[PDB]
Amino acid sequence: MEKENLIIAGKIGPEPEILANMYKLLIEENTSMTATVKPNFGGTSFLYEALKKGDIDIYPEFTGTVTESLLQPSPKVSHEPEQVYQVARDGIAKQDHLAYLKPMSYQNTYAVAVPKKIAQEYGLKTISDLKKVEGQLKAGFTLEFNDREDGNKGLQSMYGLNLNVATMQPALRYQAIHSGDIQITDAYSTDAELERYDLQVLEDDKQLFPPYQGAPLMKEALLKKHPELERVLNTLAGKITESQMSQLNYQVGVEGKSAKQVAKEFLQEQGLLKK
Numbered sequence: 501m502e503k504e505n506l507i508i509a510g511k512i513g514p515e516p517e518i519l520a521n522m523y524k525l526l527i528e529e530n531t532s533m534t535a536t537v538k539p540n541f542g543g544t545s546f547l548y549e550a551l552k553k554g555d556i557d558i559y560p561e562f563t564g565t566v567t568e569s570l571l572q573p574s575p576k577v578s579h580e581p582e583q584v585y586q587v588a589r590d591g592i593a594k595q596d597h598l599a600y601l602k603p604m605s606y607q608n609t610y611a612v613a614v615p616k617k618i619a620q621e622y623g624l625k626t627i628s629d630l631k632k633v634e635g636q637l638k639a640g641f642t643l644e645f646n647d648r649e650d651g652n653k654g655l656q657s658m659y660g661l662n663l664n665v666a667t668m669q670p671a672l673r674y675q676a677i678h679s680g681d682i683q684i685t686d687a688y689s690t691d692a693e694l695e696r697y698d699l700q701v702l703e704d705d706k707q708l709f710p711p712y713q714g715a716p717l718m719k720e721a722l723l724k725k726h727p728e729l730e731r732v733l734n735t736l737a738g739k740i741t742e743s744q745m746s747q748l749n750y751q752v753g754v755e756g757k758s759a760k761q762v763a764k765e766f767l768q769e770q771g772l773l774k775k
């Protein structure tokens with residue numbers, strides 16, 4: 501009886517798809533609940549509004565994204581990842597009555613990336629160095645990174661950078677930078693494409709980017725109906741290194757492995773999942 505089915509969605513990319521499947525695997529093993537993973541469901545605003553509306557039940561959301569996009573007005577937060585989690589978790593519960601579980605260990609930050617030869621040619625080590633060459637290089641940014649105060653709007657406001665920006669589909673920006681039609685893109689720090697395409701991440705010297713740790717986001721009402729979801733999904737808390745998540749992304753995004761299988765093998769190897 502009562503085999504309730506949860507909708508777990510992810511933002512664009514292998515990582516949310518991997519994360520969502522880990523949520524499904526954990527949920528189905530340890531609760532009387534099934535789960536459906538919705539890969540590549542949308543961007544932050546869509547996932548967030550889908551959650552509040554009940555179209556989805558869980559998705560992995562990132563701490564700095566809670567503080568910077570989701571919370572309005574955005575609070576001025578530190579760079580301590582734990583403090584940023586607490587503001588996110590308390591802020592989003594007050595604002596929208598969403599429960600935000602404990603963050604995973606790794607950080608997946610927005611990272612301004614250039615090909616390694618571009619960085620050598622133009623002497624680019626930090627984001628500030630782009631001011632030197634903002635009239636020579638072409639940037640390709642996701643639409644969301646463009647519109648985000650911690651994205652390109654913050655490249656303008658904090659760095660003074662007025663880059664020549666073309667808004668890209670997320671999956672195209674990496675092929676553009678590789679083939680040469682753009683020279684700057686908004687990478688995600690754990691993206692396998694960084695290592696695969698000789699992309700060098702420019703250092704965030706003015707510290708525009710907040711901490712970004714992922715954790716399940718969910719209505720508080722769902723957590724009251726199923727309190728076991730907190731214990732169950734929190735076995736991921738403080739776990740998964742950038743190196744581990746990067747390898748998982750390689751497997752799904754580069755090797756074409758199934759995200760469920762990659763998540764499953766990993767949770768099993770970590771002892772987080774039977775067999």
Ligand SMILES: C[N+](C)(C)[C@@H](Cc1c[nH]c(=S)[nH]1)C(=O)O
Pocket residue numbers: 511512542543544561562565608609610644670688689712
């Ligand atoms: C984790 N991250 C890199 C800081 C972004 C990634 C992201 C934002 N929108 C989509 S789609 N992906 C986020 O989830 O906010």
